[PDB]
Amino acid sequence: TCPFYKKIPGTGFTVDAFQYGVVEGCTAYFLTHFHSDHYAGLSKHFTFPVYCSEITGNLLKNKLHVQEQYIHPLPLDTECIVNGVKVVLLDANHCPGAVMILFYLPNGTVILHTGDFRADPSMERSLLADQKVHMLYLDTTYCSPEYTFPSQQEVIRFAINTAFEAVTLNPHALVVCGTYSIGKEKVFLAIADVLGSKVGMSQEKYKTLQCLNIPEINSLITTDMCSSLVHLLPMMQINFKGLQSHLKKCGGKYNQILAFRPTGWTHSNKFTRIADVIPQTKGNISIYGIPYSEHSSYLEMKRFVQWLKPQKIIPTVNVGTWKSRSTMEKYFREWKLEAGY
């Protein structure tokens, strides 16, 4: 049964709730982004509206094969009427096609649903700056003060450096980047740009990338592996046994791999900075973990919430245990007492 934090009061709207069959009264099913925990359930056989971004739409049609008529894409930053409700889509600074949704209820309540988001000060000068938000449905993925991590731009720096160094030292070295979903495309696109290459990948990953409205994308990616010295692989495959396996296939064309595992938070964030990172090394293969996050840090979250001054907060992540629920409420209370709302 669909949980209450996936439903929107005073509407026939639900958000990311595609895994429960028909939800009684739901006239519309919103999908915030193309990540499988949020879309679990969609298929070609859906015959209810789905509202999403254009980009999410493309992935819906081309990867899951939903029929064009039931995919209502909407532009961002545009006041849109939907079954006699004003709604707006806002960029979530998560993965490609990810949005937050503003719901403007008939009774006068305003609700923000963040989806998955990485809070940022640029949001504080968006359409949100114009009016009061009574209810916040919040991505609480890293809602605890141990969760710190660097800026995305700091990380892209380190990367552009590690890679460009090695390739200049050894010109027969390959760069490999791990992936398992959309998101974090900046990691491999930036490395390739500094190296003068396209990024090589499987047919299926090329297909996914061609749905994202990246400008100039035809110049940046290829399915011809031989011709490219930045390769994408499954994250499952980014290990010694698997990187050996892959290093065989390339047919004596490279004598060293240099890999990157963009990850979220790990416990080594607590003790080691980004400028002071190292890899595991089993012979000629070297694997970097690098903490490129597409979710809010605790400080980033805190700031956004204290600016918004919501009257109520409804967590959407880590809501499955009473201990997590309790811990989160305590932080919300602190924030509110500090900030005077």
**Dist. CA 278–CA 260, nearest whole Å:** 11
- Give the strand order in the sheet containing 173-179: 221-222, 199-200, 230-234, 173-179, 256-263, 285-291, 280-282
Contact window for Ni ion (CB under 5 A) among 35-43, 54-62, 264-272, 313-321: 35-43
Name which position in 11, 30, 35, 85 contacts Ni ion (CB under 5 A). Answer: 35
- Taking the complex as a whole, the smallest distance from the CB of residue 182 to Ni ion amounts, in Å, to 9
CB of 53 to Ni ion, least distance (A): 14
Token reading at 338 = 């500090």
Structure tokens at 246: 């892959």
**3-class secondary structure, 130:** helix
The reply to whether 118 sits near Ni ion by the rule CB under 5 A is no
Comparing CB distances to Ni ion, the nearer of 35 and 198 is 35
In degrees and rounded to multiples of 5, residue 140 shows phi and psi of -100, 25
Ramachandran angles phi, psi of 113, nearest 5°: -110, 115
CB of 285 to Ni ion, least distance (A): 29
Instruction: Report in angstroms how near the CB of residue 35 gets to Ni ion at its nearest.
Output: 4
How many whole angstroms from its chain centre is CA 294? 5
Measured from the CB atom, the residue of 59 and 229 that comes closer to Ni ion is 59
**Among 116, 139, 185, 300, which residue interacts with Ni ion (rule: CB under 5 A)?**
116
Mark the segment that binds Ni ion (CB under 5 A) among 113-121, 224-232, 238-246, 267-275.
113-121
Integer angstrom CA distances of residue 181 from 42, 74, 185 = 16, 23, 10
Residue among 85 and 136 whose Cβ is closer to Ni ion:
136
Classified as helix, coil or strand, 19 is: coil
Minimum Å gap between C-beta 115 and Ni ion is: 8
* Residues binding Ni ion: number (CB under 5 A): 2
* Residue 313 to residue 149: CA distance in whole angstroms: 24
Q: How far apart are CB 295 and Ni ion at their closest, in Å?
A: 8
> Per-residue x/- mask for Ni ion, residues 318 to 337, rule CB under 5 A?
--------------------
Which parts of this chain interact with Ni ion (CB under 5 A)? 35, 116
